[PDB]
């Protein structure tokens, strides 16, 4: 059986090291890789190390350990909420901006602590570990999980045992994402993870610099999926102790906070060497304590944090655009864009919240739609630089004609993008209303719905703008001038 797993991992490494198969064959490849992974997983015994107690049986130890090492442990308690899972709940009133959580550096798991641990020897030799701090943290987690007297045992014993990252989805749950923007990144995550498991399985079972690792006795695919999912859903960037560089870290106790809309209120205090969190809003006793994770899209939250966030005010989709080399005006348009600090082709964003396009995308679309004489006015003479400076400003159009053209283009492009999905908004809403679904399936369906709702909002906005600027052109109103 040891020889059998080694050969299955060899085949998996070869399969997942193959070049990209082409976007049209990525689903086929994904199913093929899943088949190999699931065959390996069913031949293994799950997580190599499991604990006897329930998850909540270990939170008292987490609190004592954090307390002994200088962290805040009063004013909150751990509660298993249905929607978010375990999180923190206030036991007293906490006022907005109050410093209520702090975590000294000695409690953290960092790239630096990974190097100085039992992983150190293999880290010092393996090019991938040295280049990929996130992968290093995952093996740091696994090595300490498998070490009976690890300093971080109270943290590791309170981590979840399962996640809702796409690595855990059923095939049919991922199938809901066919034809979306997000599914390519799900394919990549799966292939990356399986390739990494197969590579490190071989390294650990043969290489001498890994001879002393606790993972030589047992290193299962489930172990690795758990480890990378733990890191991706909760890792943080912090400054190094001298504050000159940045590093990746897991931050115990504070990382139990769940997400809500707002602003980042967690920062590193270099002088006192600890993470510090101030209250994002008022929390009354009995309310869940939330933080704002960051301005990530629902794609990023699903794929990398394992959840979908309703009413994510930072949600967005990608839109790829560029000036065509076949444009008679390419040279002038590319020069205007270069002077404005915008590339000639790029992946932009469409946003759910107003305004749907950024200053950069507005500037791009204005140039994309300029006439030769407008381009000359942005290239020549003593007002050309002033004209460049306003290109991102909605209040100062190049011309009414330019606006009608660019909103007409965006309306048409967003409408076209909507037609490339395998279901409609109305159909997705019917699915969510009329079918009974798992959490994971709902994540996938809400993600594909969300992509389309952003496109549909852009269509409607572009149509309103087009009609506004058409009327200004009909009335030949005087153009605004920036003063």
């Amino acid at each position: 059986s040891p020889k059998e797993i080694l050969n299955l991992t060899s085949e998996l490494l070869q399969k997942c090291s193959s070049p990209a198969p082409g976007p049209g064959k990525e689903w086929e490849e994904y199913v093929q890789i899943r088949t190999l992974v699931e065959k390996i997983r069913k031949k293994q015994k799950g997580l190599s190390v499991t604990f006897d107690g329930k998850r909540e049986d270990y939170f008292p130890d987490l609190m004592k350990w954090a307390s002994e090492n200088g962290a805040s442990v009063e004013g909150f308690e751990m509660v298993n909420f249905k929607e978010e899972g375990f999180g923190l709940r206030a036991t007293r009133d906490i006022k907005a901006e109050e410093l209520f959580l702090w975590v000294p550096r000695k409690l953290l798991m960092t790239v630096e602590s990974a190097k100085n641990s039992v992983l150190g020897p293999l880290y010092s030799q393996d090019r991938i570990l040295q280049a990929m701090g996130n992968i290093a943290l995952a093996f740091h987690l696994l090595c300490e999980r498998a070490s009976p007297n690890s300093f971080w045992q109270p943290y590791i014993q309170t981590l979840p045992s399962e996640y809702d990252t796409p690595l855990y989805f059923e095939e049919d749950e991922v199938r809901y994402l066919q034809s979306t923007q997000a599914i390519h990144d799900v394919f990549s995550q799966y292939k990356n993870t399986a390739r990494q498991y197969a590579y490190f399985y071989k390294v650990i079972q043969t290489h001498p610099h890994a001879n002393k690792l606790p993972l030589k006795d047992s290193f299962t695919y489930e172990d690795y999926r758990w480890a990378v999912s733990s890191v991706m859903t909760r890792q943080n960037q912090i400054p190094t102790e001298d504050g000159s560089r940045v590093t990746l870290a897991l931050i115990p106790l504070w990382d139990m906070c769940n997400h809500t809309n707002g602003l980042i209120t967690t920062g590193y205090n270099l002088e006192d060497d600890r993470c510090e969190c101030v209250a994002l809003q008022d929390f009354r006793a009995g309310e869940q304590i939330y933080i704002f994770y960051g301005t990530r899209s629902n794609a990023e939250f699903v794929i990398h944090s394992g959840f979908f966030f309703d009413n994510n005010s930072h949600d967005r989709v990608k839109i790829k655009l560029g000036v065509s080399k076949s444009d008679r005006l390419y040279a002038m348009k590319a020069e205007v864009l270069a002077r404005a600090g915008i590339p000639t082709s790029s992946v932009f964003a469409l946003h759910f919240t107003e305004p749907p396009i950024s200053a950069q995308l507005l500037a791009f679309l204005r140039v994309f739609c300029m006439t030769e004489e407008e381009l000359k006015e942005h290239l020549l003479g003593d007002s050309a630089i002033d004209r460049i400076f306003t290109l991102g400003n909605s209040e100062f159009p190049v011309s009414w004609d330019n606006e009608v053209k660019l909103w007409t283009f965006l309306e048409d492009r967003a409408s076209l993008l909507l037609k490339t999905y395998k279901t409609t908004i109305e159909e997705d809403k019917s699915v969510l209303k009329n079918h009974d679904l798992s959490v994971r399936a709902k994540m996938a369906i809400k993600l594909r719905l969300g992509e389309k709702e952003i496109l549909e909002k852009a269509v409607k906005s572009a149509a309103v703008n087009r009609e506004y600027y058409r009327q200004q052109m009909e009335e030949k109103a005087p153009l605004p001038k920036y003063e």
Binding site: M132, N236, Q237, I238, I264, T266, G267, L270, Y293
Partner: peptide
């Protein structure tokens, strides 16, 4: 205030 903002679950490249 935050010289060093901390983003929970900051997205990284896995290859």
């Amino acid at each position: 205030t935050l010289k060093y903002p901390i983003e929970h679950g900051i997205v990284t490249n896995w290859d």
